[PDB]
Amino acid sequence: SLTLTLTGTGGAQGVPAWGCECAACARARRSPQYRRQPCSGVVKFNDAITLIDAGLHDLADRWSPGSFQQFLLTHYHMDHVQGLFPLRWGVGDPIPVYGPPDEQGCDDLFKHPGLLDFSHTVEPFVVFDLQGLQVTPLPLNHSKLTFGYLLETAHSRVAWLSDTAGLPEKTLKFLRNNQPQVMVMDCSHPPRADAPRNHCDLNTVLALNQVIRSPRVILTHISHQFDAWLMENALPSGFEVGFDGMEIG
Amino acid sequence: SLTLTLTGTGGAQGVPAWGCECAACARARRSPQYRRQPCSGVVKFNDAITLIDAGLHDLADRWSPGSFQQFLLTHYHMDHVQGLFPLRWGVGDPIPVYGPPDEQGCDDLFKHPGLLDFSHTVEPFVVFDLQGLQVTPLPLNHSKLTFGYLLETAHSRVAWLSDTAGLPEKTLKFLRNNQPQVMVMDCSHPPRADAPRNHCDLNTVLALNQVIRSPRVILTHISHQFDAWLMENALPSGFEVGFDGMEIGV
Numbered sequence: 001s002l003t004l005t006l007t008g009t010g011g012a013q014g015v016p017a018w019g020c021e022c023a024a025c026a027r028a029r030r031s032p033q034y035r036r037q038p039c040s041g042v043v044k045f046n047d048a049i050t051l052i053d054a055g056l057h058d059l060a061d062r063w064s065p066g067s068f069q070q071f072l073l074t075h076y077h078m079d080h081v082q083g084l085f086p087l088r089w090g091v092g093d094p095i096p097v098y099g100p101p102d103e104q105g106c107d108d109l110f111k112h113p114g115l116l117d118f119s120h121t122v123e124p125f126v127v128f129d130l131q132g133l134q135v136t137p138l139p140l141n142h143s144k145l146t147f148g149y150l151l152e153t154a155h156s157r158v159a160w161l162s163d164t165a166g167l168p169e170k171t172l173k174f175l176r177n178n179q180p181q182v183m184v185m186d187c188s189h190p191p192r193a194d195a196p197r198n199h200c201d202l203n204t205v206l207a208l209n210q211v212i213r214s215p216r217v218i219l220t221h222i223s224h225q226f227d228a229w230l231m232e233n234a235l236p237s238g239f240e241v242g243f244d245g246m247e248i249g
Numbered sequence: 250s251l252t253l254t255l256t257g258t259g260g261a262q263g264v265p266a267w268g269c270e271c272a273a274c275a276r277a278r279r280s281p282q283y284r285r286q287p288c289s290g291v292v293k294f295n296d297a298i299t300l301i302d303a304g305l306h307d308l309a310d311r312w313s314p315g316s317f318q319q320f321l322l323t324h325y326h327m328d329h330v331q332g333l334f335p336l337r338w339g340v341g342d343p344i345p346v347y348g349p350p351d352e353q354g355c356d357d358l359f360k361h362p363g364l365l366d367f368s369h370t371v372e373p374f375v376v377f378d379l380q381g382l383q384v385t386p387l388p389l390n391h392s393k394l395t396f397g398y399l400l401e402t403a404h405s406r407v408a409w410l411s412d413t414a415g416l417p418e419k420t421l422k423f424l425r426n427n428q429p430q431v432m433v434m435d436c437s438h439p440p441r442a443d444a445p446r447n448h449c450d451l452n453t454v455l456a457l458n459q460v461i462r463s464p465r466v467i468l469t470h471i472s473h474q475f476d477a478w479l480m481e482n483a484l485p486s487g488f489e490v491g492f493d494g495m496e497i498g499v
């Protein structure tokens with residue numbers, strides 16, 4: 001069995017953005033269901049649990065040491081690893097952290113890892129196994145060394161693709177060739193005429209799925225500007241917006 | 250009116266420590282008043298508000314841009330600045346951040362400060378004014394460039410001294426000569442046979458105050474091991490343990 005929960009669907013700024021009173025941020029202050037925490041997920045394959053990224057600040061309250069099997073990191077920007085900082089001082093057995101071979105990490109995680117074991121680095125396009133789940137690292141287009149991941153079982157294929165601006169050629173072809181049934185994709189911005197540089201806008205996501213043809217694209221890493229746009233514009237069939245806590249089967 | 254609220258009184262590990270079943274951690278789970286969030290304070294002087302350190306993760310819920318006057322930072326360890334990372338992307342006027350002239354900061358705060366203005370670096374023993382509050386930076390003994398602060402108004406004096414081990418000579422002498430009525434001091438550790446390197450134990454605090462002679466020392470940055478010790482052992486007169494939400498007046 002393969003399930004995926006989106007625990008956070010925002011970017012670093014979040015929704016509401018601090019001090020902002022735009023339509024999306026004001027709504028999220030009034031109704032918590034519309035809040036967006038840092039982009040992160042939970043994957044459950046049978047009994048085995050993987051935490052994708054660690055930008056949430058309350059992991060120590062959601063989980064106890066030993067209650068999940070590993071972290072899987074996309075990259076070392078603060079909004080994807082800030083939740084590791086207090087966890088590392090816990091009491092328990094070592095916790096494997098799988099991720100890209102970023103040689104610097106973030107602040108002093110690598111020098112003072114506590115119970116976190118960052119030795120589990122992975123390689124582009126080289127499949128590795130997490131309790132039987134087949135995971136393929138996919139290089140993304142981002143200011144840090146950043147991997148997305150294909151998650152595969154006998155019957156299911158899900159892609160986790162944040163943070164990215166467009167996709168590198170080989171990654172794009174890989175996804176077209178290994179069509180995911182579900183793609184969770186960075187779409188920080190509303191439709192733009194050009195670019196952007198570090199994250200996709202909606203036009204870029206539409207262009208990418210013209211190639212990949214995933215039947216279910218779930219947008220994440222949503223900025224408050226995109227949320228405001230979504231309050232007044234519909235998405236095309238086959239696209240939906242993620243929300244914090246969304247469960248995917 | 251000068252008042253100080255301790256919004257967090259723990260170290261990086263916190264109380265409860267993640268996964269720990271010791272008596273102090275179990276107590277904090279059962280009785281949340283005993284939880285200890287990252288070492289931080291809120292100073293209110295007349296109308297003005299200063300946030301001392303920024304390790305709390307819920308600042309955006311507690312405050313809005315412009316609802317306080319400035320941040321005052323002791324140092325750039327994560328447990329003292331992690332709360333700044335989401336806030337910087339906010340909407341509003343620039344927010345002054347006063348602190349030591351650490352050339353690196355933490356991660357990409359300096360490169361991408363957003364609405365935070367880190368240009369307000371301060372100097373050892375050089376007084377600066379925060380809406381009438383007289384503040385003196387005091388070098389501490391710690392693995393990062395770290396300042397504590399004397400806060401003074403109308404001959405009322407409060408020292409904020411975390412994180413530190415034994416105090417540098419000049420700082421110790423300055424405090425003896427400017428005896429604070431209240432000192433909030435790093436005491437991460439229960440009493441030890443040897444002074445620890447980056448944070449005081451109780452014996453070091455006792456030794457320091459035998460020189461400074463402040464009549465009221467409030468211990469903070471408290472580890473779960475020290476809480477466990479405090480559950481079975483009393484502090485000497487003139488020393489008390491801080492707690493999250495503690496209110497201090499002068």
Ligand code: VO4
Pocket residue numbers: 011012077079163198199
């Ligand atoms: O810090 V980012 O979520 O714009 O790569």
Ligand code: VO4
Pocket residue numbers: 260261326327328412447448
């Ligand atoms: O991260 V510390 O509170 O031991 O300086």
Ligand SMILES: [Mn+2]
Pocket residue numbers: 011012039077079080163221
């Ligand atoms: Mn991000």
Ligand SMILES: [Mn+2]
Pocket residue numbers: 075077142144163
């Ligand atoms: Mn990023």
Ligand SMILES: [Mn+2]
Pocket residue numbers: 260261288326328329412470
């Ligand atoms: Mn500290």
Ligand SMILES: [Mn+2]
Pocket residue numbers: 324326391393412
């Ligand atoms: Mn420190």
Ligand SMILES: [Zn+2]
Pocket residue numbers: 016017020021022023024025026224225
């Ligand atoms: Zn907004």
Ligand SMILES: [Zn+2]
Pocket residue numbers: 265266269270271272273274275473474
């Ligand atoms: Zn404990």
